[PDB]
C-alpha cells in the first residue's frame, strides 16, 4: 500500500516539472516565432516602399 501511494505521488510530482518545462518551451518558441515574423513584415514594407520609389 505504501509503495502504491508513493508511486502515485511520484507520478504527480513528475508531471508538474513535465508541464512546466513544456510551457517554458512553448514560451521560447512563441517568442522566436513572433520575433522572426516581425522581420518578414518589415521586409514586406521595405519592398513595397522601394518598389513605389523605383517608378
Amino acid at each position: 500500500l505504501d509503495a502504491k501511494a508513493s508511486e502515485h505521488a511520484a507520478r504527480m510530482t513528475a508531471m508538474k516539472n513535465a508541464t512546466d518545462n513544456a510551457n517554458e518551451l512553448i514560451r521560447t518558441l512563441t517568442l522566436s516565432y513572433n520575433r522572426a515574423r516581425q522581420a518578414a513584415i518589415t521586409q514586406e514594407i521595405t519592398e513595397i516602399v522601394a518598389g513605389a520609389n523605383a517608378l
Binding site: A18, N21, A22, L25
Partner: protein
C-alpha cells in the same frame, strides 16, 4: 556521387544508417528536453548513445589547425572511415566515454585516448 554503384553497398549502407540515426536523434530533442532522458524507451536510449558518439566522431583534427592548437592533425582514408563507422554502429565501443571521440583520426586513436584518460 553517393550512390550504391559508385561507392559500394557497404559504404552506402553505412552512410544511410548514420544519417538515419542522426535524424532520429534530432527528432528526439523535444521529448528529451520535456520528459527527460530517463523516460525514453530502451531503444531510443541506445539511439542517443550511438548518435552522440557518431556526432563526436565526425569531428577531425586538421593539418592547418596546428596554428590554433598544438594537435598535429591526421589524414584518414575512406576505408578506415567506413570501417570505424561500421564498428561504431555494431555497438563495439558503446562503453567508451563521449570525449574520447573528439578531434582524432582513425578509430584506433579513440581507444588510445580512452586508455590515456583511464577508461
Amino acid at each position: 556521387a553517393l550512390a550504391p554503384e559508385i561507392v559500394g553497398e557497404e559504404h552506402y549502407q553505412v552512410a544511410r544508417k548514420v544519417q538515419q540515426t542522426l535524424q532520429r536523434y534530432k527528432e528526439l530533442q523535444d521529448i528529451i528536453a520535456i520528459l527527460g532522458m530517463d523516460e525514453l524507451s530502451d531503444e531510443d536510449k541506445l539511439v542517443v548513445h550511438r548518435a552522440r558518439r557518431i556526432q563526436f566522431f565526425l569531428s577531425q583534427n586538421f593539418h592547418v589547425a596546428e596554428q590554433f592548437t598544438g594537435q598535429p592533425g591526421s589524414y584518414v582514408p575512406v576505408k578506415e572511415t567506413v570501417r570505424g563507422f561500421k564498428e561504431i554502429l555494431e555497438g563495439k565501443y558503446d562503453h567508451l566515454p563521449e570525449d574520447a571521440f573528439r578531434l582524432v583520426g582513425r578509430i584506433e586513436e579513440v581507444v588510445e585516448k580512452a586508455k590515456a584518460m583511464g577508461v
